[PDB]
Write a protein of this length. Structure first.
Length: 71
């Protein structure tokens, strides 16, 4: 293991939607809590997405994108 910051991100994702109750996590908010840039963050999120960890809760284009865990 070496990702470290990525694990922190995953923790933030779980704990956020936990506090949002019925709403998923916000791409920005993950960057705020972690203290990172939107691009860097969405990279980690998208990789975790395609491997099954996270799912894209969004209408499509023109939206900030909401992230929710499943696998």
């Amino acid at each position: 293991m070496s990702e470290s910051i990525v694990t922190k991100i995953i923790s933030i994702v779980q704990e956020r939607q936990n506090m949002d109750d019925g709403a998923p996590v916000k791409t920005r908010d993950i960057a705020d809590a972690a203290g990172l840039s939107i691009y860097q963050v969405r990279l980690y999120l998208e990789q975790l997405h395609d491997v099954g960890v996270l799912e894209k809760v969004n209408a499509g284009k023109g939206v900030p994108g909401l992230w929710r865990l499943l696998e």
